[PDB]
Design an enzyme around this catalytic site. Structure first.
Site, short mmCIF file in Angstrom:
data_model
loop_
_atom_site.label_atom_id
_atom_site.label_comp_id
_atom_site.label_asym_id
_atom_site.label_seq_id
_atom_site.Cartn_x
_atom_site.Cartn_y
_atom_site.Cartn_z
N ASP A 159 0.83 -1.20 0.00
CA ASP A 159 0.00 0.00 0.00
C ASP A 159 0.88 1.28 0.00
O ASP A 159 0.38 2.38 0.21
CB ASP A 159 -0.93 0.00 1.21
CG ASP A 159 -0.15 0.05 2.53
OD1 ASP A 159 1.10 -0.11 2.51
OD2 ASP A 159 -0.82 0.25 3.56
N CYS A 165 4.70 -0.34 3.35
CA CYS A 165 5.12 -1.64 3.81
C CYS A 165 6.55 -1.64 4.40
O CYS A 165 6.81 -2.48 5.25
CB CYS A 165 4.88 -2.71 2.74
SG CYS A 165 6.21 -2.89 1.53
N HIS A 223 8.60 -3.91 -2.95
CA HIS A 223 7.86 -4.46 -1.83
C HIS A 223 8.78 -5.15 -0.79
O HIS A 223 9.78 -5.73 -1.18
CB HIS A 223 6.80 -5.38 -2.41
CG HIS A 223 5.78 -5.77 -1.40
ND1 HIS A 223 5.94 -6.86 -0.58
CD2 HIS A 223 4.61 -5.20 -1.06
CE1 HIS A 223 4.89 -6.94 0.22
NE2 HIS A 223 4.06 -5.95 -0.06
C1 LIG Z 1 6.55 -1.34 0.56
C2 LIG Z 1 5.26 -1.11 -0.19
O1 LIG Z 1 4.17 -0.85 0.29
N1 LIG Z 1 5.44 -1.24 -1.58
N2 LIG Z 1 4.35 -0.91 -2.46
C3 LIG Z 1 3.81 -1.87 -3.29
O2 LIG Z 1 4.02 -3.08 -3.05
C4 LIG Z 1 3.05 -1.33 -4.46
C5 LIG Z 1 2.19 -0.22 -4.27
C6 LIG Z 1 1.50 0.32 -5.41
C7 LIG Z 1 1.65 -0.31 -6.68
C8 LIG Z 1 2.47 -1.40 -6.84
C9 LIG Z 1 3.18 -1.88 -5.72
CL1 LIG Z 1 4.34 -3.17 -5.95
#
Ligand SMILES: *CC(=O)NNC(=O)c1ccccc1Cl
EC number: 3.4.19.12
Length: 225
Positions: free
Chosen positions: A43, A46, A219
């Site tokens: 989101d 993370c 992520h």
């Molecule tokens: C660390 C974190 O929250 N990374 N965000 C995502 O995993 C993400 C958010 C919006 C679009 C794509 C992705 Cl991978």
């Protein structure tokens, strides 16, 4: 468990990139060094959510390390005030972070801690606290970040746009800054789709890590040694 999952066997994440040769090889390699993984919601929050949960989990039942961490947390309002944040505007976020530290101390269970980090309100107040602290620490040490990270960067604009607001993605600078601000030693394992070595970085260089994170597709997921 929509923000931070239950613990799963490491190879359970093969299902997230089925028939991907390189992902499969690196995940198989990772499974030789780590036993288990927790998944985090993607989101934009993370990194903060994963570091905050995994570090507090690592303190459970360690009475000296809890006392030392609480002593540091009690000083963090001074860091915020020196960087120009107003007490009446950070109060709610500081109180939420202090509260979960006390839970670690008084309750001492994984299940209670995981319930707080999956409560959208408590968990988001914790993330916002960690973002304000990261911004304060960078601002108060602007010459350090310019000298060692990037002589051309605009520190105040970067903190305003890429640290303070919820759902803004991190880079190397925010990881270094929050590690330093809370004296948390962490290791990041990097998994991309290039036919290269599975590799890691430690923050700071010296250190024995408390926390291990898997970085894969902007992520961060939590690893267990
Ligand atoms: C660390 C974190 O929250 N990374 N965000 C995502 O995993 C993400 C958010 C919006 C679009 C794509 C992705 Cl991978």
């Amino acid at each position: 468990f929509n923000l931070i999952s239950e613990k799963c066997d490491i190879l359970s994440i093969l299902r997230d990139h089925p028939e991907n040769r390189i992902y499969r090889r690196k995940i198989e390699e990772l499974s030789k060094r780590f036993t288990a993984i927790r998944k985090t919601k993607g989101d934009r929050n993370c990194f903060y959510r994963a570091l905050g949960y995994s570090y507090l989990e690592s303190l459970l039942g360690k009475s000296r390390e809890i006392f030392k961490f609480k002593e540091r947390v009690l000083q963090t309002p001074n860091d915020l005030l020196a960087a120009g944040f107003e007490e009446h505007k950070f109060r709610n976020f500081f109180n939420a972070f202090y509260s979960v530290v006390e839970l670690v101390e008084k309750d001492g269970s994984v299940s209670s801690l995981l319930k707080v980090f999956n409560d959208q309100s408590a968990s988001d107040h914790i993330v916002q606290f960690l973002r304000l602290l990261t911004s304060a620490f960078i601002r108060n040490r602007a010459d350090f970040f310019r000298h060692f990270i990037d002589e051309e960067m605009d520190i105040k604009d970067f903190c305003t746009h890429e640290v303070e607001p919820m759902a803004t993605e991190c880079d190397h600078i925010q990881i270094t800054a929050l590690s330093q601000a809370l004296s948390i030693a962490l290791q990041v394992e990097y998994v991309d789709e290039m036919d290269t070595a599975l590799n890691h970085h430690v923050f700071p260089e010296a250190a024995t890590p408390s926390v291990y994170l898997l970085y894969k597709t902007s992520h961060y997921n939590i690893l267990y040694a």
